[PDB]
Design a protein around this ligand. Structure first.
Ligand SMILES: C[C@H]([C@@H](O)c1ccc(O)cc1)N1CCC(Cc2ccccc2)CC1
Ligand SMILES: C[C@H]([C@@H](O)c1ccc(O)cc1)N1CCC(Cc2ccccc2)CC1
Lengths: 306, 306
């Protein structure tokens, strides 16, 4: 029936996006209940970003300096406070479109949808993963900050990312909704370089199962391997080490397809050592690593939401 | 700032999705104003699908046989009629969430977002193109039929696709919202094979411009070409022939980057003749053809919507 990189439907998050302007800076915020969440660097000028002292910059700001606009209607700020790298703007009206939601801090390897916004207005939606180096490979231009990453389970929106910074190398860094950066990144314009971008081995294996379920099977071979043996090969190619937990997580895909996890590892090994010789898998000429096992089961089984 | 395959935000379409059940068949419909649109094969059994006579099958159906459910609320069918391959179910309540919208029949090469649904509930969202052979490469399982494809311009939803059929080869066929199939496909379980899947040359060039704007430039060379010369090469590799209209459409990307369209064609030629030698472009090991020139400008410039 086919396999595609798909995002969660975005409507529940669309209804939470607002525009935050402090002085000459405009970016996005997230309106849940009577609180608007946005990056604290909204209070900075472009100059401030080299060496900002956020507590000091904050002292000069009052409730009325934060202009918050929900589509065409202005929201009244009745309180503000800084939590880590985010600002929480208390407004006098609960967002009537607040969905059921949680704040979750995800682990590397975990996937989520991003609703890219500009001036509190939604631009587009795409799927991302937290890379093992704690960056993400997004699509963000100036004014996109405060765009959020999320997952949905039936009717609950688990928000996991807010966008803050682009590194000189074109990749993206940001926070959870408590304002704590993923990785060692900070909201300052300095020399911060990303570490090694390793491949999320468990996600590649999940995606190979997805290929098999959809008819792409040329890469299945007559071999098997061990975790230890496979991991010697993974390390050489900058792949996350595979653990027994990962094997356990792939158990459902294993069961449905009748290909043992270690046999699929031997398929992956051979693809790493020999390449794809110009062939493709689910329409890709390289090995996709931004589907989780849970992603594969969900799109392959057709789970939906409130 | 990065470049990603992104769909339009899906909320406006989410609010139009309903479930249609006729007998033992459940699939999705689209509720706009006081009309629900759905595939006419909702009236078929699995057996009927080999050789259905839709007019005859329809005679046994009445308004009350169409069960239409909008989330948890039932809609009253007060009229029904068949238009080409779709059924229009007149209900007694206008959808309060009807967005501004149009019905457009797109051309091959044109891109759109699909909101995959199951039982009137949204599952996920992804970007697609009408292939030159009038198929699309989607992600659709049983019960997905009646899922729609759309574009948004600011506040207007232009619906262009409704999903009807999977061909034996794993690709997808469907109609415009007047119920007319794209291509020579029909809503009957028969031997219908897709034609040659040619690459959408104009979209590849657009995406190479996108790469250059984002820092990927290793494939720019010291050469140029002519339309005629380039097209000899395109034909050999099953690429759509490039026309002066295409060149004109790429004019804005040409202008912004200062790479002439024909110079970019010579880059493409070299990539076709020599391959990518294991390198990548915007994170792909093959040449993406499901971004339009207009797509590139939009994500690269940050256009948003009501
Ligand atoms: C593979 C999936 C899904 O259930 C699943 C995915 C991943 C898992 O880890 C577990 C389950 N099922 C869905 C039902 C399909 C029935 C079918 C057969 C032939 C033609 C048309 C339809 C057979 C495959
Ligand atoms: C390329 C895009 C966009 O406008 C566009 C895209 C495709 C077109 O066909 C036409 C225009 N612009 C956006 C503004 C950017 C300003 C900038 C420069 C340096 C650092 C940060 C920001 C420079 C590039």
């Amino acid at each position: 029936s086919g396999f595609r990189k798909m995002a969660f439907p975005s409507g529940k998050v669309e209804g939470c996006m607002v525009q935050v302007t402090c002085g000459t800076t405009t970016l996005n915020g997230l309106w849940l209940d009577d609180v608007v969440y946005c990056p604290r660097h909204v209070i900075c000028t472009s100059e401030d970003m080299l060496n900002p002292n956020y507590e000091d910059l904050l002292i000069r700001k009052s409730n009325h300096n934060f202009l918050v606009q929900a589509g065409n209607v202005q929201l009244r700020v009745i309180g503000h406070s800084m939590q880590n790298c985010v600002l929480k703007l208390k407004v006098d009206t609960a967002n009537p479109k607040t969905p059921k939601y949680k704040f979750v801090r995800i682990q590397p390897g975990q996937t989520f949808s991003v609703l890219a916004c500009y001036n509190g207005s939604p631009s587009g939606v795409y799927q991302c993963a937290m890379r093992p180096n704690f960056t993400i490979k997004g699509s963000f231009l100036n004014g996109s900050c405060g765009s959020v990453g999320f997952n949905i389970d039936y009717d609950c929106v688990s928000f996991c990312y807010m966008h803050h910074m682009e590194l000189p190398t074109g990749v993206h860094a940001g926070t959870d909704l408590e304002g704590n950066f993923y990785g060692p990144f900070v909201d300052r314009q300095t020399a911060q370089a990303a570490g090694t971008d390793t491949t999320i081995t468990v996600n590649v294996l999940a995606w190979l199962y997805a290929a098999v379920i959809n008819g792409d099977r040329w890469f299945l071979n007559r071999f098997t391997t061990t975790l230890n043996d496979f991991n010697l090969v993974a390390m050489k190619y900058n792949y996350e080490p595979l653990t027994q937990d990962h094997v356990d997580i792939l158990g459902p895909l294993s069961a449905q397809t009748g290909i043992a996890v270690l046999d699929m590892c031997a398929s992956l090994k051979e693809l790493l050592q020999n390449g794809m010789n110009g062939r493709t898998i689910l329409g890709s000429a390289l090995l996709e690593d931004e589907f989780t096992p849970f992603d594969v089961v969900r799109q392959c089984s057709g789970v939906t939401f409130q």
